[PDB]
Design an enzyme around this catalytic site. Structure first.
Site, PDB file in Angstrom:
ATOM      1  N   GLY A  82     -24.352  -7.754   1.066  1.00  0.00           N
ATOM      2  CA  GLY A  82     -24.580  -8.043   2.089  1.00  0.00           C
ATOM      3  C   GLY A  82     -26.179  -8.760   1.792  1.00  0.00           C
ATOM      4  N   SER A  83     -26.998  -8.523   2.628  1.00  0.00           N
ATOM      5  CA  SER A  83     -28.152  -9.265   2.700  1.00  0.00           C
ATOM      6  C   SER A  83     -29.274  -9.019   1.430  1.00  0.00           C
ATOM      7  CB  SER A  83     -28.920  -9.031   3.959  1.00  0.00           C
ATOM      8  OG  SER A  83     -30.040 -10.129   4.307  1.00  0.00           O
ATOM      9  N   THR A  84     -28.901  -7.987   0.799  1.00  0.00           N
ATOM     10  CA  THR A  84     -29.449  -7.548  -0.455  1.00  0.00           C
ATOM     11  C   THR A  84     -29.341  -8.502  -1.714  1.00  0.00           C
ATOM     12  OG1 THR A  84     -27.818  -5.962  -1.433  1.00  0.00           O
ATOM     13  CG2 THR A  84     -29.763  -4.857   0.021  1.00  0.00           C
ATOM     14  N   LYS A  87     -29.327 -11.803  -1.307  1.00  0.00           N
ATOM     15  CA  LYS A  87     -30.306 -13.087  -0.726  1.00  0.00           C
ATOM     16  C   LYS A  87     -31.339 -13.381  -1.680  1.00  0.00           C
ATOM     17  CE  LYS A  87     -29.126 -13.246   4.040  1.00  0.00           C
ATOM     18  NZ  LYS A  87     -29.248 -12.309   4.976  1.00  0.00           N
ATOM     19  N   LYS A 140     -35.292  -5.395  -0.092  1.00  0.00           N
ATOM     20  CA  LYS A 140     -34.661  -6.078   1.009  1.00  0.00           C
ATOM     21  C   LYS A 140     -33.643  -5.018   1.375  1.00  0.00           C
ATOM     22  CE  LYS A 140     -33.057  -9.827   2.793  1.00  0.00           C
ATOM     23  NZ  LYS A 140     -32.629  -8.516   4.046  1.00  0.00           N
TER      24      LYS A 140
END
Length: 438
Positions: free
Chosen positions: A180-182, A184, A371
Site C-alpha cells: 500500500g502507501s509504504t 509511495k 511512512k
C-alpha cells in the site's frame, strides 16, 4: 557428532548441543541375562512384556553418546534460529540453512537485546489492538544485517507440544502482502528521477476520488485539493500519486521498485522465504499504473520492504541482506541516485514531523522518517516502515500488525507507536547520538 554453536552477534548462545544417550544392545548379548530384563525395564520405565517382546549394569547394554539441541532464548528468536529434529538435523530456519556448516560456531546478525525489545513491543501491540498476528524487522542500513526479526504468534522450540500451526510461520519472511502507501516513496523516487517533478510541485487531488473506467481510485483522508509531493505522502493520497504515475509512466516506477528489491530475491538462503510479485506489462493499463504507484499492484514480504527502506536510508545504496554477523561489509549497489534518495529522506522526515503528519511515529530525542500504510486483506494489515536518525540513518524498521480488531477509526496507524518505541529503544541500545535537539 557435536553441532556447531549458534550465537547472536555479541556471542550470546542461541542454539547449543547437549549430550543424550542411545542405550543400545544387540539381540544376542542381552539374551544371556534374561533374568536382568525386568530390572532394566523397571529402571528404563517400560512394561516388562512389551520390552521382552521388543527384545525377542546389565550384560549387553552399552552407552553411545548422541547429541541434541536446546535454545537458551526460546520463543524470542524461534523463527530466525529454527530447530533440529530427534536425529539432530536442521529442519527449520538457520539450523536448516546452515545445516552442512553446523553438522563450527556461527554468529547471527541478530542482537538479542534488540530482539527482546522488538518481541516485547510487538507482543504488547497485538494484545492492545486485539490483533491476530504481527511481524517486526530491524535492519542495520550500513551493513545489511538483520538486527531483529520477530513474529507473533511464536512457539517455544524447547517445548514442541500443543503447537498451533499459526505460531510456526516465519511471517516476516513468508507472508506476502500489498504494501500500500509504504511504497509511495519509491513511486516518488521515480517521479524525482524523471526530471518532470519537484517536491514543491502541486497536484489537484480533489474530491479524494479519481474515476478510471469502471474503477474508482479513493484516498482514505479526503480533505484536500492542492497537495505538494510531501503533502501526497503525509495525506496518503492514492489520487495524487496516480496522477504523477500517469505523467511519468508505470515503467519508471516498476524500475525503481525492481532495483530496491520489491517482489525480488533477497539473496538470503533462508528456508521458506517468499519473494511475492512485482508485475510487468508490455503495455500498462491505466488502473494498473495507478495501483502499482499506490502499492496495491504488487506483493512483498516485510524483509523486502525493510531492505528497500534500508537502501533509501543509505543514500540510495543497497548493501546485501545478511542473517549472519557481517565483519567485512560488501560494496553495495547504487539503486537510487543519492540526490533523489536524499530528497525522499527529507520528505519522509516531514511525513513523521510536519503538522498533520504521523506524530505517533516520532522518536523521542531523534529525527525519524517513515511512512504508514494499510494492506486491505473487513480485514487489513496496519504497516509502518521507516528509518532513523534522519540526518545520518543507522536503522530501518518495518512493523506489520495483522487484523487489529480493537482499532476503530485510525486503525491503519496502529503500527506507528510500535515503530516509535522500538526505534527509540534500539538507537539507545546502539548508543546512537541524538540528532534532534532544540
Amino acid at each position: 557428532a557435536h553441532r556447531g554453536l549458534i550465537t547472536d552477534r555479541n556471542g550470546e548462545p542461541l542454539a547449543v548441543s547437549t549430550p543424550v544417550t542411545t542405550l543400545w544392545a544387540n539381540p544376542k548379548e542381552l539374551m544371556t541375562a534374561k533374568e536382568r530384563w525386568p530390572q532394566l525395564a523397571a529402571a528404563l520405565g517400560q512394561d516388562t512384556k512389551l520390552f521382552a517382546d521388543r527384545i525377542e549394569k546389565v550384560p549387553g547394554v552399552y552407552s553411545i553418546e548422541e547429541f541434541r539441541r536446546f535454545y537458551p532464548a526460546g520463543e524470542v528468536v524461534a523463527h530466525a534460529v529454527g530447530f533440529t529434529d530427534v536425529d539432530d538435523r536442521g529442519r527449520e530456519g538457520i539450523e536448516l540453512a546452515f545445516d552442512e556448516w553446523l553438522a563450527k560456531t556461527l554468529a547471527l546478525s541478530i542482537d538479542l537485546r534488540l530482539q527482546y525489545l522488538a518481541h516485547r513491543e510487538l507482543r504488547n501491540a497485538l494484545l492492545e489492538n486485539g490483533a491476530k498476528a504481527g511481524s517486526l524487522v530491524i535492519m542495520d542500513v550500513k551493513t545489511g544485517e538483520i538486527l531483529a526479526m520477530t513474529n507473533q504468534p511464536t512457539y517455544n522450540p524447547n517445548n514442541r507440544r500443543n503447537l498451533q500451526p499459526a505460531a510456526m510461520r516465519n511471517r516476516a519472511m513468508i507472508d506476502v502482502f500489498e504494501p500500500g502507501s509504504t511504497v509511495k516513496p519509491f513511486s516518488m523516487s521515480a517521479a524525482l528521477a524523471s526530471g518532470r517533478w519537484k517536491p514543491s510541485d502541486i497536484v489537484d487531488v480533489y474530491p479524494g476520488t479519481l474515476q478510471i473506467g469502471r474503477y474508482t481510485i479513493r484516498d482514505v483522508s479526503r480533505n484536500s485539493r492542492q497537495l505538494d509531493l510531501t503533502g501526497i505522502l503525509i495525506k496518503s493520497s492514492n489520487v495524487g500519486i496516480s496522477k504523477i504515475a500517469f505523467d511519468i509512466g508505470a515503467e519508471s516506477i516498476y524500475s525503481v521498485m525492481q532495483q530496491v528489491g520489491l517482489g525480488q530475491d533477497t539473496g538470503l538462503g533462508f528456508p521458506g522465504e517468499r519473494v511475492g510479485n512485482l508485475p510487468n506489462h508490455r503495455k500498462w493499463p491505466k488502473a494498473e499504473t495507478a495501483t502499482l504507484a499506490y502499492g496495491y499492484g504488487l506483493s512483498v514480504t516485510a524483509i523486502q520492504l525493510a531492505h528497500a527502506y534500508a537502501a533509501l536510508a543509505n543514500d540510495g545504496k543497497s548493501v546485501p541482506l545478511s542473517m549472519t554477523r557481517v565483519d567485512r561489509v560488501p560494496d553495495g549497489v547504487q539503486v537510487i541516485s543519492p540526490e533523489v534518495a536524499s530528497t525522499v529522506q527529507g520528505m519522509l522526515q516531514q511525513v513523521v514531523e510536519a503538522q498533520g503528519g504521523v506524530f505517533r511515529a516520532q522518536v523521542p530525542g531523534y529525527h525519524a522518517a517513515g511512512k504508514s500504510g494499510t494492506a486491505r486483506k473487513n480485514a487489513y494489515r496496519s504497516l509502518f516502515a521507516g528509518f532513523a536518525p534522519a540526518t545520518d540513518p543507522r536503522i530501518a524498521m518495518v512493523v506489520v500488525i495483522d487484523e487489529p480488531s480493537k482499532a476503530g477509526y485510525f486503525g491503519g496507524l496502529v503500527s506507528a507507536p510500535v515503530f516509535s518505541k522500538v526505534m527509540a529503544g534500539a538507537l539507545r541500545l546502539m548508543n546512537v547520538p541524538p540528532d534532534n535537539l532544540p
